[PDB]
Structure formats: C-alpha cells, structure tokens
Design a protein around this ligand. Structure first.
Ligand SMILES: CN1C(=O)[C@@H](NC(=O)c2nc(Cc3ccccc3)n[nH]2)COc2ccccc21
Ligand SMILES: CN1C(=O)[C@@H](NC(=O)c2nc(Cc3ccccc3)n[nH]2)COc2ccccc21
Lengths: 259, 263
C-alpha cells in the first residue's frame, strides 16, 4: 500500500486546472502523485492516515478512481492514484471537436454505474462535479475525490456550489445523503449538453427553485435526458430517484436510442 | 412480494408482458398448490430478484398458481453464447473481447454478493440483439427450492467446464476458484467457436485426463487469440484452486488490454 520515490524510474510535473506529478513506476506503470503537505513527521494521526489509504484502495470498480498507494518519506505525505490521459469532464467538453452524442450517452451511464457502486458500499461523494469526473484517452470515465471530501484524515493534513444540493446550501449541519449526489448528477447532465459551467443572491435563488436554464443548451439533447435532469434537481430530496433507479431507466434508453 | 399474475400474458413457455416486454417462462411444476411450501418458493425468488447487475439475469417474477409454478425472466433473443459462436456470421475480436469483459463483471458481481455459480458454461451465458451478455442459471443450481420442485414425483417434471477438484474422488464443495476454472474453458471456446475435447473417446478417459493436467488444446486457438488471453486462461485453469486469480483480479488485468487492443 506504500511506495517509495525510488520505485519510479522517471517522473514529470504537470499543472492542470493542480500541482500534481506524473511518474513511471517500475512494475505497474504510469500513475499520478500529489504532495498533500510538507513539514516534520507527525505523531498523532499517522496510523489512521495509512488506514484511510487502505479503505480507499479497496473501492475497486471500473468507473471509480483507484488509489494505488501512499509515499511517506523525509517529511512528505503524498497520495498516488491512476492516470486519466484526457484530464477531467469539462476539459473534454470544452475541446474543439464536439464529443459524439453516443459518447456523452455512455459517459452518463458510467457516472450512474460508479455512483451506484459507491452508494452500495456506503460511500456518499458530496462533491460530484465535472472537475471530479476523470476521462481516459478512450473516453471512459472514473469518479475521483480530488477535493478530499471523503479523505477525512488527508483533508486535516492541509469549491463549487453550482452542483450542491439546496438542502446543503445555508445548512452545513444537514447530513449528505444518496439524494445529495443525485442533485449534483442533474447539474453534471446539464454541463455535458451545454458544454460549459452553469450560472449570496445566487444561493437564495437556487434555494427557491432556480436551476441551470435548459434553453442555454445549444447543441442536440434528447427530451428524455432533459426530463431526467429536471427530476434529479427536484427541490424535495424524497422526490429525486436513486442511482439504481436512474440506471434501470437510462440503460434501456442508451441501448435502444444512443449506443 | 414480487409475484406475477398470468392475467398479463398469453400461452406458448414464451409470453409478452404488457408494460415489461417479451419474456421467457419455465413451468417447473404442474399440480396442487398449497400456501405453506409457497413462502419458501416466494422468498428464494425475492432473493434472486435482488441480484441486480447489467451482466446477470434478473428474475422478474414467479407465477404460483393452481397447476402451475413458473419462473419468469426477460427473453434473450440470440440464445446462449454457444449458439452465437457456432452461427454462420463470424464474430470479430472486438465483440468477443467485450463478451469476455461482461462475463468477468457479472461474475465479480455475483462473488461480491457471495453467490458461487457452480455451473458456469456457454449455455448459462445469454445474448441479446445488441451482442451484450447476461449470466444465467438455467439448470437451477442456485435455486434450492425451485430445483426441489423440479424433482418431485407428484409433478409432471457440464463436464467440460467443471474444475478438476469436482471431478475428483474427494469431490469437495464449490468455491469462487471453481467458477474461475469454468471461465478459463469458456475463454477458450469463445476463440475456438466450438466445445473443447472433440478428440476425447471415453468420458472416464476425459475425467482422468483433466485431473492429471489436460486442458483444451491451445494450438486450436492460436487462430487468432492474443498471447495475453492465452496466458490468462492458462492462469485461470491451474490445477491448484488457490493459484487461480479472483474475478476482480482478472478484471484489473483484462480491462486495460481490451481498451488498448480490442475496443
Ligand atoms: C493524486 N491524487 C489522488 O490520489 C486523489 N485520489 C482520489 O481522488 C481518489 N478517488 C478515489 C475514489 C473515490 C473515493 C471516495 C469518493 C469518491 C471516489 N480514490 N482516490 C486525491 O488527492 C488528489 C487531489 C488532487 C489531485 C490529485 C490527487
Ligand atoms: C424462466 N427462466 C428463468 O427465470 C431462469 N432464471 C435464471 O437462469 C436466472 N439466473 C439468475 C441470476 C443468477 C443467479 C445465480 C447464479 C447465476 C445467475 N436469475 N435467474 C431459470 O429457469 C429457466 C430455465 C430455462 C429457461 C428459462 C428459465
């Protein structure tokens, strides 16, 4: 679960929309490394910082990012994850060539898959956003936690409200649920077909019922997907469906009309 | 709780359900119906109905009626995997490799839910009109109560893919590794477009040969199976059950190779 800088034959640092380093590991290959903090070795939380890593490494699914390990040496604490060549969802959505409707259709279903898996494993994201959806060179996605919203030990060691559920806006104490991530998914649905980010006075608008304008989407989007985002960004969390329920409607649809 | 009425359908078994599409039925028992033995039958069905995954068959319902105990599931138009590989129209590697990866995902799902198949074979791998697959249990090997109903007196009612340990004189209980062996043989048959061991003359010659280390003929599938899938099936059909990899382990090995060389 823990690696050494020496296990990497070569490495390069790339800054993206951040401060990550790509390295070629001997046996496994290309991985992304990020130094969480720099300073003297800790004494209080080092034991459970290695256990957090073990818990995350055991979330294995095709649509979910796998934490490969941790590098702890001479006052450095760094997480190691797999490499997604094309960066994140918005980078791919703002590219010159338009992403085919078929590929956008497949991405949505893969976001559903990864989300249904994490929920089934008792994991609530609370930070689902295009910046957290990582795309490989084959246009397949993996859900990541780059804002350390689920890495509580690693968060202590060292933000978009456009995707945040209204129940969480001006109510930090409310517990994040499966319905919190469904709301974020609806805004992700919008950002996919609109190919851009949506939108104190904004927060009260979103709390009243204001949502990203469907009319702002220029390119072609099915009426059925429009209805799916509307339903998922519903004010009452109880009215919103679950990811296995989104999947049982989206999968036949994708297979009949988009694949 | 998820019990179907015959009212929705028509007789054949094969029926169109209003609002749920075409379905295939299996009438397991025809005779006197009694409420006591039925809960055990309804509960087991509710148990299978909760194995929900894109690559595993979802039992939709049961029809417990007078003179009819039936299992209901969605009809897979192209039949089993074997019928598809043996068809006139040749299947390209991209489709075969996607089929292989679907099997792994289905099996990783079932194992993660504690389900050990015990009867993994091309006959239990079902295909739709879009060349996507589902893992079934047509032999009722996991259906303890429905299988017992299928063996009554008052009622009207394989070898090539079995692990060496189960062919053995010892014949211990199945494991996850038992299914990994079955998978290795299916991998070979996907690339051979036929059942293994054609050159076998006697069943006991076969049984003793597998226990000794005989496996499907690798030379018959170098036309054309990548060296990667060959090493994989060789690893999955190892004599020692503890030396076989896990399905999530096989998934982490097959997914990157399929994306670069086959998709
Ligand atoms: C280098 N790098 C990482 O390793 C990052 N890892 C993940 O985002 C990660 N998501 C999962 C799956 C998961 C687990 C829980 C919830 C959702 C998904 N497992 N790990 C965190 O730190 C970074 C921060 C910024 C850039 C790079 C990194
Ligand atoms: C009508 N019909 C069915 O429903 C058949 N069902 C399945 O094979 C089935 N596999 C699973 C998942 C699963 C669960 C455990 C292990 C593997 C897979 N769930 N159901 C059984 O009986 C039949 C016999 C013949 C034709 C049709 C049917």
């Amino acid at each position: 679960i823990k690696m050494k800088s020496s296990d990497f034959l070569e490495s390069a640092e790339l800054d993206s929309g951040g401060k990550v380093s790509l390295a070629f590991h001997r046996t496994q290959g290309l991985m992304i490394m990020k130094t969480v903090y720099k300073g003297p070795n800790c004494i209080e939380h080092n034991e459970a910082l290695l256990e957090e890593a073990k818990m995350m490494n055991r979330l294995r699914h095709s649509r979910v990012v796998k934490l490969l390990g941790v590098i702890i040496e001479e006052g450095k604490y760094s997480l190691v994850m797999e490499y997604m060549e094309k960066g994140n969802l918005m980078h791919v959505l703002k590219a010159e060539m338009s992403t085919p409707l078929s590929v956008k259709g497949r991405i949505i279903l893969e976001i559903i898959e990864g989300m249904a898996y994490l929920h089934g494993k008792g994991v609530i994201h609370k930070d689902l956003k295009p910046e957290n959806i990582l795309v490989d060179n084959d246009f397949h996605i993996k859900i990541a936690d780059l804002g350390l919203a689920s890495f509580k030990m690693w968060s202590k060691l060292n933000g978009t409200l456009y995707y945040m559920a209204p129940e969480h806006l001006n109510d930090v104490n409310a517990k994040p649920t499966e319905k919190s991530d469904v709301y974020s998914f609806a805004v992700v649905l919008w950002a996919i077909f609109a190919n851009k980010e949506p939108y104190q006075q904004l927060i009260m608008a979103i709390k009243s019922g204001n949502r990203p304008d469907v009319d702002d989407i220029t390119e072609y989007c099915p009426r059925e997907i429009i209805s799916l985002m509307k339903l998922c960004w519903e004010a009452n969390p109880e009215a919103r469906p679950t990811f296995p329920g989104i999947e049982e409607k989206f999968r036949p649809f994708y297979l009949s009309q988009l694949e």
